[PDB]
C-alpha cells in the first residue's frame, strides 16, 4: 500500500500513515530523465505538527503543505532538515513564508550555504559530535556520524518506535550506491552501527527514498556501501 512513482503525478505529494501520529510524505522529482521518489516524515506534536524534510523543491513543498492542510488539518509549526542537499532543504523558503520555523544543525546550515542551497533559519545545538542526541519535541534527533553526508541526522519517534533514517539509509530495492558526491564512505558503516546501537528497539525504519522496512535496512545499507567502496 506504500505509494510508488506510479501513483504520484508530477508536482503532487502523497501521505502515508506509519503509526499513530506518524506519517511519511512522498513526492517525486526527475533527474537525467528518470523519476525518483523521496520521503520525509510528519510527527504529530500535541495539536501541532513537526515536519521532517521538505518534499524536494518549492512546488512539491507547497503541495505538501496543501495536502497536510487537507488531510490532517493541524498547523505545521516546525521543520527539521536532515542534511544540506536539495531533496531535504529545497522548499525551505516556502515553509518559511507559510510561518513554519525551519531548523537544521549548524553543520547542515554551513554546508547548505556553501552549496548555494536554501538555508533553514534556526540552528539545532548539541549535534556536532558523532553519537550526539537531542530531544526535539516528540522526536529525538541523532547525529550518527558522517555517512551519506557529513551532516546527516536521523530522527526517532519514541512513542511509535519509528526510526527515520533519511538519506543515510537505503531501501532494500536499492542494491548499488546512490548519490555519494558528499559521502564519507569510510565512516558510513561506523555511523550505521551507531544507529543500530542507539535504536535497537525501532519497529519501523524509513529510508530517504523508497519503501519502509525494519532494522534490516541498516545492514542492507552497510552491504551496499561496502560493495561501492570496493569497486
Ligand atoms: C535524491 C538523491 N539525492 C540525495 S540522497 N542527496 N542529494 C540528492 C540529489 N541527487 N540529484 C541529482 C539531485 C537533484 C538531488 Cl537533490
Ligand atoms: Zn543528499
Ligand atoms: Zn523562528
Ligand atoms: Zn535523499
Numbering used by the authors: 32 to 262
Copy text from the publication.
BLs are categorised in two distinct families, according to their catalytic mechanism, and further divided into structural classes (Ambler’s classification): class A, C, and D serine β-lactamases (SBLs), which utilize a catalytic serine for β-lactam hydrolysis, and class B metallo-β-lactamases (MBLs), which, in turn, require divalent zinc ions for catalysis. Finally, subclass B1 MBLs inactivate nearly all β-lactam antibiotics, with the sole exception of monobactams. This class includes variants such as IMP-1, VIM-2 and NDM-1, whose worldwide emergence has characterized recent decades. Here, we present the identification of a series of non-covalent scaffolds targeting SBLs and concomitantly MBLs, through a large virtual screening study, in vitro validation, microbiological analysis and X-ray crystallography.
High-resolution structures of compounds 24 and 31 in complex with VIM-2 and NDM-1 MBL have been determined by single-crystal X-ray diffraction at 1.60 and 1.38 Å resolution, respectively. Two molecules per asymmetric units are present in both experimental models. In VIM-2 binding site compound 24 orients the central sulfhydryl-triazole-based scaffold deep in the pocket, with one of the triazole nitrogen contacting Zn1, while Zn2 is coordinated by the sulfhydryl group. The second triazole nitrogen interacts with a crystallographic water molecule. Surprisingly, no other direct contact is formed between the inhibitor and the surrounding residues. As mentioned, with respect to the apo form, Zn1 and Zn2 positions are only marginally shifted, maintaining a distance of about 4.6 Å between them. The side chain position of key residues involved in the metal atoms coordination, i.e. His116/94, His118/96, Asp120/98, His196/159, Cys221/178 and His263/220, is conserved. For compound 24 in VIM-2, the docking prediction orients the molecule in the opposite way, where both zinc ions are coordinated by the sulfhydryl group and stabilized by additional hydrogen bonds with Arg228/185. Still, a slight adjustment in the pose orientation can be observed, in particular because of the presence of Phe61/62, not detected in the X-ray binary complex. The lack of the residue side-chain is likely associated to a higher flexibility and opening of the loop L3 observed in the here reported structure, with respect to the structure used for docking simulations.
